């Protein structure tokens, strides 16, 4: 249940 893909990933690798 621990989130393994941090939301910052989507914020930062989207363009």
């Amino acid at each position: 249940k621990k989130q393994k893909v941090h939301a910052l990933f989507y914020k930062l690798d989207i363009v």
Partner: antibody, heavy 125, light 107 residues
Framework: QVQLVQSGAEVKKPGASVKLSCKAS????????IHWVRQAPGQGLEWMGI????????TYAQKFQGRVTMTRDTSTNTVYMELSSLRSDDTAVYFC??????????????????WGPGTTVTISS | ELTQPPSMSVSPGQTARITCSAD??????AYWYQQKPGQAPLLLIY???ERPSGIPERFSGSSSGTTVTLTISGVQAEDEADYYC???????????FGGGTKLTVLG
């Protein structure tokens, strides 16, 4: 070995800006995010924000949105943090730190595995 | 927000247990750092329980519900320092540190 080299101590007057630098070596610069963290004298650590040098994208803590700017130079594997309209409350040591994990669609862990030594910034008239 | 005790004392050889608590921890990994005065923090524990290379096994980490705990065994004088937990906000975006725990080694 991963090393992060930070620019020397800064002394500023209230209202000025300061641009700090963090020069990374020993790993692939564009594979990892860089954090900035500050610590006022006697106090605790406070996260300021993060930059992804691959895509040149940033995110800052709510209290620093609007007065921090992080930038990067891949030619020199350097990250910069600019803080504007400095106040006495901005006196602190400013650290940069490499993100502990390589981030992709299958996995992204966000913490700091290697820290720079800190740049002292003193605000005084 | 992350709550850990501001301070804790222990005698040489004893075991220290520093806990950090917040509603968000069941869904977010935590990280533990050691900082000695005038030095850069040092990562002790990541993803709640994993210890980097170079960190001694005296340091271990555990998770339980809304708490995470750093355990130091065989405390030596050189473990006197500030220990910080770090995780992410209820926003799931912004990183937050605990207030830090000053560890005093008695004697």
């Amino acid at each position: 070995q991963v090393q992060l080299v930070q620019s020397g101590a800064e002394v500023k007057k209230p209202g000025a800006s300061v641009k700090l630098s963090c020069k990374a070596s020993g790993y692939t610069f564009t594979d990892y995010y860089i954090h900035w963290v500050r610590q006022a004298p006697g106090q605790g650590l406070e996260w300021m924000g993060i930059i992804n040098p691959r895509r040149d994208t940033t995110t800052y803590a709510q209290k620093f949105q609007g007065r921090v700017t992080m930038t990067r130079d891949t030619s020199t594997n350097t990250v910069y943090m600019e803080l504007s309209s400095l106040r006495s409350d901005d006196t602190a040591v400013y650290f940069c730190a490499k993100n502990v994990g390589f981030c992709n669609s299958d996995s992204c862990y966000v913490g700091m595995d290697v820290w720079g030594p800190g740049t002292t910034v003193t605000i005084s008239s | 927000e992350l709550t850990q005790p501001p301070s804790m004392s222990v005698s040489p050889g004893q075991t220290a247990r520093i806990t950090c608590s917040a509603d968000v921890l069941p869904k977010q990994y935590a990280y533990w750092y050691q900082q000695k005065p005038g030095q850069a923090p040092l990562l002790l524990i990541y993803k709640d329980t994993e210890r980097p290379s170079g960190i001694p096994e005296r340091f271990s980490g555990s998770s339980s519900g809304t708490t995470v705990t750093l355990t130091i065994s065989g405390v030596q004088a050189e473990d006197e320092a500030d220990y910080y937990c770090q995780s992410t906000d209820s926003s799931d975006i912004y990183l937050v540190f605990g207030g830090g725990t000053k560890l005093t080694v008695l004697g």
